[PDB]
Design a protein around this ligand. Structure first.
Ligand SMILES: [Mg+2]
Ligand SMILES: [Mg+2]
Ligand SMILES: [Mg+2]
Ligand SMILES: [Zn+2]
Ligand SMILES: [Zn+2]
Lengths: 112, 350, 83, 71, 721, 108, 79, 180, 171
RNA sequence: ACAGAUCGUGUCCAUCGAGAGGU
């Protein structure tokens, strides 16, 4: 019902046998009832385990799993103590973020 | 045994007891659109027209005697069955097993003039009106294919009246004894066959309240037990039931089958299935006890004996009423039953 | 090729095995599989999986493959969890 | 066939009072309106914002249903 | 691709379903016969009411490979097509084939026009061929028979009728799976246009007391109105079979040739199930807060009436309603918005409500100007009847150009046009709903009025007469154009070969096709003079006596012929009734109902000359077809039971509702006018043809869907939860 | 899309050369014309480098061989009948070594 | 996570491989629910595998190089 | 769905030794010395016309008895034979079961042995020879009058059985099939 | 001709059905699956005997989803029309191409080119058949027919029959 | 017999080299 406009919203609704539904063109949201077994492509919310990477990736510490915290500015914010394993500073560095797409990957990233 | 049709009898208003016609037959017609619509089953409560016991004493078997006499005249010889009972009356006879005598009080008289058994019948509003209304909008006078659309439109808002009763005489044999029962027909769901058995073409309908918890579910299960015993007693394919609510609005109409009801009933609760088995055994036990000590004399000139059956202390109390009692004078001496034509036909059989 | 009295593998439960079991249980719960424990009002499949693993109520069997090709089957409830 | 499409509008009330923008997309009761000075897009109720002419003139409320034109 | 097919595809998706046709295999030069008794993968089918006229025509004179044989090739082609469609459908209860015969005077004028044209284009093509060999003997012309030769009363119709009986007898004898199949043949002698007989038979069967509401019927035909005809009879479990044209593969331009041959030999077919379309209509005709009660049964007949008003083969199309693809929605929404203004419905079993039609036409005329302006704008944009002043709607110009009459005459002509148009609308509705209103009604005009007309029809009443069906010879004279002397009696040829006063006026030699009435195809209008009744009738009745008795014997109305097999359940009863009594008279008629097997009706002794323990000769004498005997089939006359009352559109009791193959999402999509514009994803209709099965066949003993309550409803709710 | 074929995972890969008979056996068409789209640059030439049996060229139409679109059709292999045998560029050294190993007049 | 990143978040393709030849040259007609391998006239053992489109392209290029990368779903050992 | 793993270079055997033949040459799946689920080196089991009918009938009655006991714990000649297996199939297998009716009807119509003792002793009589169980099943099922019919019926018995022994057990089977 | 083989079947079960009744769920799955099957390798499956110790092994869980793959072991009666085998059946259909036989559940065709020219299609008799000398054959009559080979391994399974053999016809 | 204007969803402009960059 929130729609793909506010942060706590969704972009797509997947019914049985594919048949993707777009929540920004159809506008039929609100009058749609979600039956069991469907899939909803919600936005990335808080406490979501994601993969955080810096290049070049020399050791395994260059890949870490963090918890998503939504911030009101267009930049990546991290604790100062994790810069040493990343070997990164704040003079213009660029780092990549990857999100899981299944429970298997999410759980294994969180626990490993 | 398999029930076999003997004949069809009509009992219209004013006690005319017409024989051998289908003027009092109805046909089921209820589209799903009507069920979806919020039909009202309580309008015109003041339009009720009653032709039941209040109008005249319907507790008689004169019509049944006339129709069986006509059937015997058409066929000949004597029917091997030994017990005559109304379809509704026979249900109350066996219902006392699981019902208190206060709830089910039955007063009947037997006659052994034919060396057989002759049961004689002896004697809220809003619910009755709602049931009659459901019957009226659930039935049609003539077959639908020959029914004009305007007739259907008038029926959708027609008056509520009592009548058009269809009575069918069926000889049903259970165990080592054969019995003949006068069934009641309310509607014909499927097609109708002329001059042929219509037992598979008959139906049965009623009304009940909507359930809310397990207590109402158990009450509906008991009602289904009663109607299944009824159907097993007569033989009826359709046990369609109606559902009503506090606002008296039709909600759901079902399509129960005779064979499917016992299986689901046993699956729900074993206790009600055990009660079903106990009742079907007790019916045969009661019949075999009745055909044991009752004095049967095939001689028409033999003296007739009158008995009274009252269910007290979980026992059927049967005793011969003295001939000096006024009940016998007003029954046999007063020619209340055993009409002149019926007695003449009985004497001719001798 | 499934010995029982000659199981030389460690009786403890590895981190990879724990992660795989938790993930599989969470995914099954998410896709509406029956749950054998009460949830205490929880609504996250992963934490439900951890709660099930806490009391050893996960009906799964671990098949540890030896390098040659042989294997032995270890039940989840019989594996000691210490990490 | 929404009337509020590609028309210069002015936002009233809320925190964007007096701003000038052009409607881009309409999603039910909510419509997406861009901004002239600010380089951002905001979504507000279509019944709230007023409607002006493309060239420039008087402004009117959402009563444009009875007159499928500009101004 | 036809506009109607894609229009119904985009407006009503998931309706077209592919046919799971089984491909026969040949090994070691041996072709294994198809198992008729095997279960049909396309669902259970019982009735196969089929139109033979729609299968004989495509085989004859096609776009490629014309048949050189006079009749043998055509008979073989129709036989193989019938075998293919029968194997594809696999009926189990009754198969009915109908052939077009006598029609009402309206279809009469229309066919006249159509053929006359066909003759003109045949003359053009053969004179072009003649000059082609001129610029190069008479044996290279390859002049195939004209399409006008297919007309009731010709010897070709007799040959077709004889061929069908032999074909069905051979199939019944050689196929063990046809033990419980009944075949009904309606030759050209029986009046009807092929589909009218079908709907008459369907309505007659629905009136049987023992008729089964769960029976499934399928109609095969390439006509564009049979889809609406199926919805008009209010019979669920109805599927329409037709050849697929959406592919439209490349035509002909070794192994490549063999692949092209097998591609043509495997033309696909598409299903048009309307049981799942009934939900589409039910989610479309709903009106918010309508005064009177609303039901699906009353909504579909009104939609069918509106669709027929859009365009019919009897009356000319309205000038404002010419596309017949977009104006339907316009009049549908007009009817929707004007429905609350009325306290009743529009049509009641074919009865037309005058005030409702008056309001509808007044609203259409009010909206007529906007539609005309929009179409003018579209035409001008596309570009960027002789005189059209667009500002005043060219009503007077249209009248003076299509009739050439003075203002007082145009007023009286608009009055008469309104009268005749409303009478024709009532007649076509009555014909398409219940029986035939009249066999003599005609439209004495070449166009229809428009604009603010039709408002004075309220003070009128409709009353027709049964009349009498036209004889084959008079109908043949009326429909057949000039020349085409083949398949004609010598008396008619002699009448043609003399300069008679009525010959030139009624049947001229040149058709003026100057009336294109805004179109770009063979489509046109009938400028031919409207033939009267008295002159043609007197000429035919005067030419009748001198005709030979043998030729005059082909003037009986006839009756459908039943061809039940030797193992039918009612075969013994029919044989005992019609042969043991040996009454030797046309008086023994049985009245068996639909309870036993099927095909409820009244039968009688055959008048063709069928005999027991006899033999039937091959009618075509080609292909070395086996000569069978009469001990395996029974040729007897069949008669339709007259309807005791009007064919009321009421669903029969005990009907099992079809399960919804449709989700509520598309229901609300159509309800809210979501359209495919919002769905920016590519809606590949080809991919929409893969994942559709559309199960057909009653689902569940109970005839009422769960609507809460208790007991079983509570158990179902608990299971769902 | 649903396929009735059972779903399995690859367990091993067997490398090897392609026999001249096998390529012809698996080939669905023979390529002889070196020019493509010779039908007045409208359609694809039959037997050319863009034969329709080789696979679909645009998403809407289907592939004649298997009847899917581009997203599902994996493509099909043809063959070319060389007039004379041609040495493999990547096997010249191996061919020379094996020719040195064996006799040039007999297979011994 | 590696498998998901390589397949689900990237190219993912499904192909049919003949169980005798081991190649992907299998004629599949999902409309009629039948498969055939013209190389060895095989119709009763067809398997479907999930491989990235890049792997399919590499295998097709190798086949064009007169090299057969036969793929099998069973382990070959002993006898 | 298979019971034998790949062997003898099943990937690219490229032999194509036909598909079937009358003179043995049975299919690969129906090969001698089959592999049992738990055991090994077990020969192929061949069933005669009478043996197969008894096997399916006994399996059907066993399944019906199991279903009846589960429900309880939860709570002539040819003409008579058709009713028996009709009422057996109408509730045991369930479903469409269209194919099962024809097989059972063919088994009943063409049944040779109807006595349990006779069919049981058939294997004891036939075990004397070392013939392949397929051909012994063929001679047990198909009727015969002397050695010529048996020799002409199949081409798998060329000089594999002595004529005197062949005629002896052919007459033995003739009387064992004519006694019932 | 009838054989019993230790067949194997692979099935996939959704984890939403992972209850105590998985064993009986798989049992009914197999029961409706192999009944009436027309596999081209094994042949015709008629009955599934030995409804005991099915020995349902452990179900490996696919990494993609929560479903589990089961490998059930079972034995059943098979039916395959081995080429060159003499069988006896009954006539069901008889067109001008030939007369069919009802050996088991199949539709073996005896095409006109197989049996000698003695048999002639006489349509005069009420049942269409091939009445001729050397004994009488009709619809629903005893007939022994040999099998030439197996065709159409996919979908339905059937064969082609012949009568041109000494001591093969009539009977 | 029957026998269509476009509509409705529509997919992107690619490759090869060269240079300038920033962690
Ligand atoms: Mg830096
Ligand atoms: Mg009642
Ligand atoms: Mg038409
Ligand atoms: Zn392809
Ligand atoms: Zn292969």
């Amino acid at each position: 019902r929130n729609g793909p406009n506010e942060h706590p919203g969704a972009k797509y609704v997947i019914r049985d046998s594919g048949d993707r539904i777009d929540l920004r063109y159809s506008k039929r949201a609100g009058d749609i009832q979600l039956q069991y077994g469907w899939k909803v492509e919600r936005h990335i919310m808080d406490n979501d385990p994601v993969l955080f990477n810096r290049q070049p990736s020399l050791h395994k510490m260059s890949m870490m799993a963090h918890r998503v915290k939504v911030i009101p500015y267009s930049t990546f914010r991290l604790n100062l103590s994790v810069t040493s394993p990343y070997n990164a500073d704040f003079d213009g560095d660029e780092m990549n973020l990857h999100v899981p797409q299944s429970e298997e990957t999410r759980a294994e990233l969180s626990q490993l | 045994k398999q029930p076999k049709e003997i004949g069809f009898y009509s009992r219209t208003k004013d006690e005319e007891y017409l024989i051998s016609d289908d003027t009092n037959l109805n046909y089921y017609y209820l589209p799903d659109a009507e069920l979806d619509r919020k039909l009202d089953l309580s309008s015109g409560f003041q339009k009720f027209k009653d032709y039941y016991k209040d109008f005249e004493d319907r507790c008689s078997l004169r019509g049944l005697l006339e129709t069986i006499e006509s059937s015997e005249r058409h066929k000949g010889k004597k029917i091997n069955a030994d017990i005559i009972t109304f379809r509704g009356i026979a249900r109350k006879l066996i219902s006392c097993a699981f019902d208190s005598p206060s709830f089910n009080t039955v007063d009947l008289r037997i006659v052994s003039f034919n060396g057989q058994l002759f049961i004689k019948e002896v004697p809220q509003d809003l619910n009755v009106f709602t049931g009659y209304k459901f019957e009226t909008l659930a039935t049609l006078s003539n077959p639908l294919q020959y029914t004009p659309r305007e007739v259907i439109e008038k029926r959708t808002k027609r008056i509520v009246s009592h009548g058009d009763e269809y009575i069918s005489v069926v000889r049903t044999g259970v165990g080592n004894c054969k019995l003949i029962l006068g069934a009641e027909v309310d509607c014909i769901f499927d097609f109708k066959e002329n001059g042929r058995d219509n037992l598979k073409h008959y139906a049965e309908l009623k009304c009940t309240q909507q359930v809310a918890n397990i207590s109402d579910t158990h009450k509906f299960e008991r009602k289904l037990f009663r109607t299944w015993l009824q159907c097993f007693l007569v033989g009826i394919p359709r046990i369609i039931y109606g559902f009503k609510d506090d606002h008296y609005v039709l909600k759901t109409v079902e399509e129960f089958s005779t064979e499917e009801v016992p299986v689901l009933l046993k699956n729900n609760n074993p206790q009600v299935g055990s009660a079903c088995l106990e009742a079907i055994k007790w019916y045969g036990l009661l019949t075999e006890w009745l055909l044991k000590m009752i004095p049967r004399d095939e001689d028409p000139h033999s003296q007739i004996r009158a008995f009274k059956l009252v269910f007290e202390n979980n026992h059927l109390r049967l005793s011969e009423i003295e001939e000096s009692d006024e009940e016998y004078s007003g029954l046999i001496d007063g020619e209340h039953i055993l009409s002149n034509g019926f007695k003449e036909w009985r004497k001719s059989l001798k | 090729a499934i010995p029982k009295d000659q199981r030389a593998t460690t009786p403890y439960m590895t981190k990879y095995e724990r992660a795989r079991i938790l993930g599989t249980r969470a995914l099954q719960i998410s896709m509406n599989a029956p749950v054998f424990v009460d949830l205490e009002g929880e609504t996250d499949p992963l934490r439900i999986a951890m709660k099930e693993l806490a009391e050893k109520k996960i009906p799964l069997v671990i098949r540890r493959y030896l390098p040659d090709g042989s294997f032995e089957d270890w039940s989840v409830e019989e594996l000691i969890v210490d990490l | 066939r929404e009337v509020a499409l590609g028309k210069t509008v002015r936002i009233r009330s809320a925190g964007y009072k007096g701003q000038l923008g052009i409607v881009k997309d309409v999603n039910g009761d909510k419509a997406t309106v861009e901004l002239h000075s600010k380089n951002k897009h905001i979504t507000i109720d279509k019944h709230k914002l007023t409607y002006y002419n493309r060239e420039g003139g008087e402004g009117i409320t959402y009563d444009e249903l009875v007159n499928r034109r500009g101004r | 691709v036809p506009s109607f097919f894609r229009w119904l595809s985009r407006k009503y998706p998931k309706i077209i379903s592919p046919v799971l046709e089984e491909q026969p295999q040949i090994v070691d030069g041996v072709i294994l016969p198809l198992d008729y008794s095997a279960s049909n993968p396309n669902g259970e089918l019982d009735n196969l009411y089929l139109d033979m006229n729609g299968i004989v025509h495509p085989c004859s004179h096609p776009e490629n490979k014309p048949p050189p044989e006079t009749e043998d090739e055509m008979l073989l082609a129709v036989f193989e097509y019938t075998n293919r469609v029968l194997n594809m459908a696999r009926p189990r209860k009754v198969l009915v084939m109908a052939v077009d015969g006598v029609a009402p005077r309206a279809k009469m004028n229309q066919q006249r026009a159509r053929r006359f044209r066909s003759a003109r284009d045949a003359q053009i093509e053969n004179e072009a061929r003649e000059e082609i060999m001129r610029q190069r003997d008479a044996v290279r012309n390859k002049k195939t028979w004209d399409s006008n030769a297919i007309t009731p009363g010709t010897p070709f119709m007799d040959k077709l009728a004889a061929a069908l009986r032999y074909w069905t007898a051979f199939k019944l004898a050689t196929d063990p799976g046809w033990k419980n199949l009944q075949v009904i043949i309606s030759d050209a002698t029986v009046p009807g246009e092929g589909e009218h007989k079908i709907m008459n038979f369907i309505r007659s069967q629905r009136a049987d007391p023992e008729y089964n509401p769960n029976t499934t019927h399928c109609i095969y035909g390439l006509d564009a109105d049979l889809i609406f005809l199926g919805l008009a009879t209010h019979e669920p479990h109805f599927k329409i079979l037709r050849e697929d044209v959406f592919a439209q593969d490349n035509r002909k331009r070794e192994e490549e040739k063999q692949f092209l041959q097998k591609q043509n030999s495997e033309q696909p077919f598409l299903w048009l199930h309307i049981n799942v379309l009934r939900e589409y209509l039910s989610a479309e005709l709903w009106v918010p807060g309508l005064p009177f009660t609303f039901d699906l049964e009353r909504a579909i007949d009104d939609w069918v009436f509106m669709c027929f008003f859009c365009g019919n083969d009897f009356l000319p199309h309205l000038p404002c309603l010419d596309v017949r693809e977009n104006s339907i929605d316009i009049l549908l929404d007009i009817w929707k918005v004007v429905l609350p203004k009325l306290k009743t419905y529009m049509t009641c079993d074919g009865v037309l409500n005058l005030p409702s039609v008056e309001t509808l036409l007044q609203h259409l005329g009010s909206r007529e100007g906007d539609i005309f302006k929009t179409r003018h704008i579209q035409e001008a944009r596309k570009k960027e009847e002789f005189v059209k002043l667009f500002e005043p709607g060219y009503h007077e110009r249209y009248y003076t150009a299509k009739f050439h009459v003075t203002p007082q005459d145009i007023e009286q002509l608009r009055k008469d046009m309104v009268k005749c148009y409303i009478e024709g609308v009532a007649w076509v509705l009555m014909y398409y709903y219940q029986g035939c209103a009249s066999w003599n009604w005609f439209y004495p005009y070449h166009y229809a009025p428009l604009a603010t007309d039709f408002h004075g029809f309220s003070h009128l009443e409709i009353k027709f007469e049964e009349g009498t069906p036209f004889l084959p010879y008079e109908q043949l004279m009326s429909v057949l154009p000039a020349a085409s002397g083949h398949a004609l009696p010598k008396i008619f040829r002699s009448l043609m070969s003399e300069p008679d006063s009525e010959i030139i006026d009624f049947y001229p030699e040149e058709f003026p096709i100057d009336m294109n009435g805004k179109k770009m195809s063979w489509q046109g209008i009938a400028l031919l003079p409207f033939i009267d009744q008295d002159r043609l009738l007197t000429a035919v009745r005067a030419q009748y006596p001198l005709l030979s008795d043998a030729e005059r014997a082909r003037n009986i109305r006839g009756e459908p012929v039943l061809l039940i097999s030797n193992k039918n359940a009612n075969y013994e009863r029919f044989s005992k009734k019609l042969y043991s009594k040996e009454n030797n008279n046309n008086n023994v008629v049985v009245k068996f109902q639909h309870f036993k097997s099927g095909l409820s009706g009244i039968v009688s002794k055959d008048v063709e000359g069928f005999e027991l323990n006899g033999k039937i000769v091959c009618p075509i004498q080609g292909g070395s077809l086996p000569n069978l005997s009469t001990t395996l089939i029974l040729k007897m006359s069949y008669r339709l039971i007259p309807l005791p009352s009007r064919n009321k559109s009421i669903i029969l009791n005990g009907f099992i509702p079809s399960e919804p193959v449709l989700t509520a999402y598309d229901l609300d999509s159509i309800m809210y006018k979501y359209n495919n514009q919002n769905y920016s994803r590519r809606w590949n209709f080809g991919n929409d043809l893969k994942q559709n099965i559309v199960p057909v066949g009653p689902k569940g003993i109970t005839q009422y869907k769960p609507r809460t309550g208790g007991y079983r409803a509570f158990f179902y709710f608990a299971e769902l939860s | 899309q649903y396929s009735s074929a059972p779903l399995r995972t690859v367990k091993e890969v067997q490398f090897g050369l392609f026999s001249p008979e096998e390529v012809r056996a698996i080939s669905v068409a023979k390529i002889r014309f070196p020019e493509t789209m010779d039908e007045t640059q409208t359609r694809a030439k039959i037997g050319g480098l863009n034969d329709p049996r080789l696979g679909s060229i645009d998403r809407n139409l289907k592939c004649q061989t298997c009847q899917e679109g581009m997203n599902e059709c994996p493509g099909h292999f043809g063959h070319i009948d060389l007039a004379k045998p041609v040495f493999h560029v990547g096997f010249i050294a191996k061919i020379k070594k094996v020719c040195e190993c064996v006799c040039m007049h007999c297979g011994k | 996570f590696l498998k998901e990143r390589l397949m689900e978040a990237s190219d993912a393709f499904r192909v049919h491989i003949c169980g005798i030849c081991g190649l992907m040259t299998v004629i599949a007609k999902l409309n009629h629910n039948q498969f055939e391998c013209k190389g060895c006239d095989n119709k009763i053992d067809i398997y479907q595998i999930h491989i990235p489109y890049a792997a399919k392209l590499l295998f097709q290029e190798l086949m064009a190089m007169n090299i057969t990368p036969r793929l099998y779903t069973d382990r070959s050992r002993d006898f | 769905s298979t019971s034998t793993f790949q062997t003898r270079r099943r990937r690219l055997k490229k032999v194509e030794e036909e598909e079937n033949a009358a003179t043995l040459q049975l299919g690969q799946e129906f090969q001698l010395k089959q592999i049992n689920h738990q055991g090994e080196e077990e020969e192929l089991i061949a069933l005669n016309l009478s043996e197969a009918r008894l096997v399916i009938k006994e399996a059907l009655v066993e399944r019906r008895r199991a279903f009846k006991r589960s429900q309880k714990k939860h709570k002539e000649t040819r003409e008579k034979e058709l009713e028996s297996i009709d009422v057996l199939l109408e509730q045991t297998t369930g479903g469409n079961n269209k194919d099962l009716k024809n097989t059972m009807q063919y088994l009943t119509n063409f049944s040779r042995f109807r006595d349990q003792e006779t069919v049981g002793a058939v294997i004891q009589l036939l075990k004397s020879t070392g013939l392949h169980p397929f051909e012994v099943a063929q001679l047990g099922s198909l009727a015969c009058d002397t050695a010529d019919e048996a020799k002409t019926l199949i081409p798998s018995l060329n000089n594999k059985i002595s004529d005197d022994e062949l005629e002896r057990i052919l007459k033995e089977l003739s009387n064992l099939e004519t006694l019932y | 001709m009838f054989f019993i083989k230790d067949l194997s079947l692979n099935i996939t079960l959704h984890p939403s059905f992972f209850g105590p009744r998985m064993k009986q769920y798989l049992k009914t799955k197999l029961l409706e699956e192999v009944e009436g099957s027309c596999t081209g390798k094994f042949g015709y499956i008629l009955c599934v005997l030995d409804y005991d110790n099915i020995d349902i092994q452990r179900g490996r869980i696919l990494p993609t989803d929560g479903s589990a793959e089961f490998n059930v072991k079972y034995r059943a009666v098979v039916f395959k029309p081995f080429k060159g085998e003499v069988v006896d059946g009954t006539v069901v259909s008889c067109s001008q191409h030939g007369f069919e036989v009802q050996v088991g559940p199949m539709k073996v065709f005896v095409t006109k080119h197989l049996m000698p020219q003695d048999l002639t299609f006489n349509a005069g008799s009420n049942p269409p058949s091939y009445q001729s000398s050397e004994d009488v054959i009709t619809i629903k009559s005893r007939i022994r027919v040999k099998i030439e080979g197996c065709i159409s391994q996919v979908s339905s399974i059937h064969a082609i029959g012949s009568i041109k053999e000494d001591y093969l016809g009539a009977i």
